[PDB]
Design an enzyme around this catalytic site. Structure first.
Site, mmCIF file in Angstrom:
data_model
loop_
_atom_site.group_PDB
_atom_site.id
_atom_site.type_symbol
_atom_site.label_atom_id
_atom_site.label_comp_id
_atom_site.label_asym_id
_atom_site.label_seq_id
_atom_site.Cartn_x
_atom_site.Cartn_y
_atom_site.Cartn_z
ATOM 1 N N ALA A 231 60.718 16.064 -26.871
ATOM 2 C CA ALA A 231 61.920 15.296 -27.583
ATOM 3 C C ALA A 231 62.261 13.998 -26.574
ATOM 4 O O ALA A 231 62.141 12.838 -27.475
ATOM 5 C CB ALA A 231 63.084 16.101 -27.646
ATOM 6 N N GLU A 234 58.707 10.767 -26.575
ATOM 7 C CA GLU A 234 58.435 9.673 -27.541
ATOM 8 C C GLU A 234 59.623 8.897 -28.072
ATOM 9 O O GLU A 234 59.247 7.356 -27.976
ATOM 10 C CB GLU A 234 58.270 10.584 -28.777
ATOM 11 C CG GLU A 234 56.765 10.805 -29.274
ATOM 12 C CD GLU A 234 56.174 9.488 -29.592
ATOM 13 O OE1 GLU A 234 56.123 9.007 -30.903
ATOM 14 O OE2 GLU A 234 55.853 8.775 -28.672
ATOM 15 N N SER A 236 62.076 7.879 -26.361
ATOM 16 C CA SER A 236 62.655 7.052 -25.049
ATOM 17 C C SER A 236 61.320 5.904 -24.907
ATOM 18 O O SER A 236 61.750 4.718 -24.978
ATOM 19 C CB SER A 236 62.596 7.620 -23.728
ATOM 20 O OG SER A 236 63.652 8.564 -23.793
ATOM 21 N N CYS A 343 71.313 14.885 -29.799
ATOM 22 C CA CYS A 343 70.192 15.210 -28.863
ATOM 23 C C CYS A 343 70.878 15.198 -27.583
ATOM 24 O O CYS A 343 72.069 14.781 -27.144
ATOM 25 C CB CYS A 343 69.467 13.779 -28.711
ATOM 26 S SG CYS A 343 68.219 13.764 -27.498
ATOM 27 N N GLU A 352 68.416 5.989 -19.217
ATOM 28 C CA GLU A 352 67.105 5.369 -19.048
ATOM 29 C C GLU A 352 67.046 3.863 -19.737
ATOM 30 O O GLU A 352 66.561 3.187 -18.881
ATOM 31 C CB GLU A 352 65.852 6.186 -19.892
ATOM 32 C CG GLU A 352 65.516 7.131 -19.283
ATOM 33 C CD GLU A 352 64.504 8.240 -20.231
ATOM 34 O OE1 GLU A 352 64.263 7.574 -21.101
ATOM 35 O OE2 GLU A 352 64.301 9.282 -19.550
HETATM 36 C C1 HEM Z 1 66.389 6.821 -26.767
HETATM 37 C C2 HEM Z 1 66.315 8.309 -26.624
HETATM 38 C C3 HEM Z 1 66.522 8.971 -27.787
HETATM 39 C C4 HEM Z 1 66.979 9.213 -29.033
HETATM 40 C C5 HEM Z 1 67.133 7.906 -29.757
HETATM 41 C C6 HEM Z 1 66.929 10.521 -29.503
HETATM 42 C C7 HEM Z 1 67.118 10.945 -30.681
HETATM 43 C C8 HEM Z 1 67.516 12.052 -31.276
HETATM 44 C C9 HEM Z 1 67.885 12.668 -32.484
HETATM 45 C C10 HEM Z 1 68.348 11.545 -33.588
HETATM 46 C C11 HEM Z 1 68.083 13.899 -32.618
HETATM 47 C C12 HEM Z 1 68.575 14.552 -33.727
HETATM 48 C C13 HEM Z 1 67.619 14.880 -34.996
HETATM 49 C C14 HEM Z 1 68.367 15.706 -35.722
HETATM 50 O O1 HEM Z 1 69.334 16.397 -35.719
HETATM 51 O O2 HEM Z 1 67.525 15.818 -36.867
HETATM 52 C C15 HEM Z 1 67.409 14.143 -31.327
HETATM 53 C C16 HEM Z 1 67.308 15.526 -30.967
HETATM 54 C C17 HEM Z 1 66.997 16.057 -29.698
HETATM 55 N N1 HEM Z 1 66.857 15.309 -28.635
HETATM 56 FE FE1 HEM Z 1 66.587 13.360 -28.590
HETATM 57 N N2 HEM Z 1 66.685 11.455 -28.485
HETATM 58 C C18 HEM Z 1 66.296 10.736 -27.233
HETATM 59 C C19 HEM Z 1 65.991 11.083 -26.170
HETATM 60 C C20 HEM Z 1 66.016 12.186 -25.461
HETATM 61 C C21 HEM Z 1 65.872 12.743 -24.429
HETATM 62 C C22 HEM Z 1 65.960 11.800 -23.197
HETATM 63 C C23 HEM Z 1 66.010 14.107 -24.564
HETATM 64 C C24 HEM Z 1 65.619 15.177 -23.526
HETATM 65 C C25 HEM Z 1 65.544 14.810 -22.105
HETATM 66 C C26 HEM Z 1 65.977 14.541 -25.807
HETATM 67 C C27 HEM Z 1 66.089 15.767 -26.448
HETATM 68 C C28 HEM Z 1 66.271 16.060 -27.569
HETATM 69 C C29 HEM Z 1 66.651 17.617 -28.034
HETATM 70 C C30 HEM Z 1 66.339 18.575 -27.308
HETATM 71 C C31 HEM Z 1 66.882 17.607 -29.498
HETATM 72 C C32 HEM Z 1 67.243 18.867 -30.007
HETATM 73 C C33 HEM Z 1 68.621 18.848 -30.617
HETATM 74 C C34 HEM Z 1 68.846 20.312 -30.764
HETATM 75 O O3 HEM Z 1 68.831 20.989 -31.831
HETATM 76 O O4 HEM Z 1 69.659 20.846 -29.696
HETATM 77 N N3 HEM Z 1 65.996 13.434 -26.584
HETATM 78 N N4 HEM Z 1 67.314 13.204 -30.414
HETATM 79 C C1 LIG Z 2 63.114 15.612 -30.173
HETATM 80 C C2 LIG Z 2 62.578 14.641 -31.281
HETATM 81 C C3 LIG Z 2 63.727 14.219 -32.311
HETATM 82 O O1 LIG Z 2 64.263 13.120 -31.678
HETATM 83 C C4 LIG Z 2 63.563 14.169 -33.679
HETATM 84 C C5 LIG Z 2 64.988 14.091 -34.355
HETATM 85 C C6 LIG Z 2 62.656 12.995 -34.171
HETATM 86 C C7 LIG Z 2 62.321 12.684 -35.529
HETATM 87 C C8 LIG Z 2 63.756 12.391 -36.393
HETATM 88 C C9 LIG Z 2 61.957 14.141 -36.203
HETATM 89 O O2 LIG Z 2 63.090 14.814 -36.175
HETATM 90 C C10 LIG Z 2 61.053 14.597 -36.647
HETATM 91 C C11 LIG Z 2 61.306 14.978 -38.113
HETATM 92 C C12 LIG Z 2 60.486 15.977 -35.700
HETATM 93 O O3 LIG Z 2 61.623 16.692 -36.187
HETATM 94 C C13 LIG Z 2 59.341 16.422 -35.982
HETATM 95 C C14 LIG Z 2 58.343 15.523 -37.315
HETATM 96 C C15 LIG Z 2 58.391 16.145 -34.844
HETATM 97 C C16 LIG Z 2 56.858 15.990 -35.226
HETATM 98 O O4 LIG Z 2 58.568 14.838 -34.281
HETATM 99 C C17 LIG Z 2 59.218 15.481 -32.805
HETATM 100 O O5 LIG Z 2 58.779 16.289 -32.162
HETATM 101 C C18 LIG Z 2 60.059 14.650 -31.922
HETATM 102 C C19 LIG Z 2 59.482 14.365 -30.730
HETATM 103 C C20 LIG Z 2 61.410 15.461 -32.227
HETATM 104 O O6 LIG Z 2 61.163 16.740 -31.456
#
Ligand code: HEM
Ligand SMILES: C[C@@H]1[C@@H](O)[C@@H](C)C[C@H](C)C(=O)[C@H](C)[C@@H](O)[C@@H](C)[C@@H](C)OC(=O)[C@H](C)[C@H]1O
Length: 394
Positions: A231, A234, A236, A343, A352
């Protein structure tokens, strides 16, 4: 009737349709690229918050291959995004104990030293150089290794796995699976090492049991470590590139941070809101019950999709939403998402970005885009926007 996404994305521009939909039809019906049926598309902040935040919506439901989705493979039900309460709520509770904001801030010094080293490499190369190759790509995976207390000798193995997990991976073998398993065994061993001797890193904290108290399985911890790597990577990697793009294409903005480096954190927030990092809609949310939005009431079993970037440009919430302002009083953007699935890495994502921008501003006030704007190679096929290359001069 209409297909989503509406058009191929150009740069970080937003499709002019969204702005129309906010005014005329906030909740629209839409046909997604891969599931069967129509779905609802949410375009405004209040509605988005409801879909994301309210317990009447389920992500777990979206695992059904018949359910509409933005991506070709049906979602894995194990993905934390696809987890529903209260099992999901447990994961978040437990990992949230260790992943404090306080733990992230304390990483800042080691993260600064890390960026410094990366930039030193870039200076060794000499101006001009690809900021993607030297900064954006290596930096996030290093940061996450720091977070997991991976020893330096073994970080090589993490880079290969992150690059292999991306859909754009060049190697694209049967072997990918071989990498995955190899990596998995390593993580197993790393967690077992943490159970035997506690470490001060986030795996270490998760490994500890107060032993009258709630803690994660060893297998849960391993899986969580993989979830955090993928997560966080990609999003970041591209997000770094995207903020720099915004900063240099109107260079008055970058100069504003040179003039006032303390402005960086505010600026990072503003750019998080402004940037459509997610080109497409959201992971799908299916209604368990009838729920009332702004303009329409969603019937149970109907799929909803949120476009975070549109919500972030909602005119009701933000003055001059289309403009980029580092001096907003308030900025309640949902760039990180909202509600249950906010997230987890929201703090480490901010770290970062703030540390990458501050370092650039501090080492390179003369930083500039060497590649012509028209020349820029934006990634084409992808769910997430970013530049394949970004050549800069100083
Ligand atoms: C610029 C950096 C980042 C952005 C813009 C971002 C954005 C997002 C967004 C929008 C979601 C929610 C998607 C949804 O609910 O449909 C999400 C979920 C998540 N992100 Fe990120 N993310 C970022 C960096 C990271 C980093 C650094 C980590 C971990 C080190 C991370 C781990 C996750 C995880 C684990 C979720 C799952 C939420 C859950 O169900 O607990 N992401 N991220
Ligand atoms: C952790 C991120 C998270 O930021 C999500 C919200 C990014 C985008 C909006 C997505 O949620 C995207 C729809 C993912 O759920 C999957 C398509 C997957 C193939 O992509 C992803 O796996 C990406 C890396 C998710 O797992």
């Amino acid at each position: 009737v209409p297909a989503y996404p509406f058009s191929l994305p150009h740069a970080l521009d937003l499709d002019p349709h969204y702005a129309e939909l906010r005014r005329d039809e906030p909740v629209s019906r839409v046909r997604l690229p891969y599931g069967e049926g129509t779905a609802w598309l949410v375009t405004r902040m209040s509605d988005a918050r409801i879909v994301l935040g309210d317990s009447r919506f389920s992500t777990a439901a979206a695992t059904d291959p018949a359910t509409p989705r933005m991506f070709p493979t049906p979602p894995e039900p194990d993905g934390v995004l696809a987890q529903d309460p209260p099992d999901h709520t447990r994961l978040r509770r437990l990992v949230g104990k260790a992943f404090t904001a306080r733990r992230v801030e304390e990483m800042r010094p080691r993260v600064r030293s890390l960026v410094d080293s990366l930039l030193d490499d870039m200076v060794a190369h000499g101006s001009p150089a690809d900021l993607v190759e030297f900064l954006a790509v290596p930096f996030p995976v290093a940061v996450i290794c720091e977070l997991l207390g991976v020893p330096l000798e073994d970080r090589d193995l993490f880079r290969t796995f992150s690059d292999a997990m991306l859909s754009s991976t060049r190697l694209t073998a049967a072997e990918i699976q071989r990498v995955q398993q190899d990596f998995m065994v390593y993580m197993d061993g790393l967690v077992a090492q943490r159970r035997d001797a506690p470490t001060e890193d986030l795996l270490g904290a998760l490994a500890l049991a107060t032993d009258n108290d709630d803690h994660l399985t060893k297998g849960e911890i391993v899986n969580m470590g993989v979830s955090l790597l993928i997560a966080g990577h990609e999003t970041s990697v591209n997000q770094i590139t995207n903020l720099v793009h915004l900063l240099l294409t109107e260079r008055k903005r970058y100069e504003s941070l040179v003039a006032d480096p303390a402005l960086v954190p505010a600026a990072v927030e503003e750019m998080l809101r402004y940037t459509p990092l997610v080109s497409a809609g959201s992971f799908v949310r299916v209604a368990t019950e009838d729920v009332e939005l702004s303009t329409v009431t969603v019937r149970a079993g109907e799929p909803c999709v949120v476009h975070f970037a549109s919500a972030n440009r909602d005119e009701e919430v933000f003055d001059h939403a289309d403009e980029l302002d580092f001096h907003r009083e308030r900025n309640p953007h949902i760039a990180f998402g909202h509600g249950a699935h906010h997230c987890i890495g929201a703090q480490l994502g901010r770290l970062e970005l703030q540390e990458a921008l501050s370092a650039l501003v501090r080492r390179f006030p003369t930083l500039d885009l060497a590649e012509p704007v028209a020349g820029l190679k934006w990634k084409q096929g992808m769910l997430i926007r970013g530049l394949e290359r970004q050549i800069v001069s100083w």
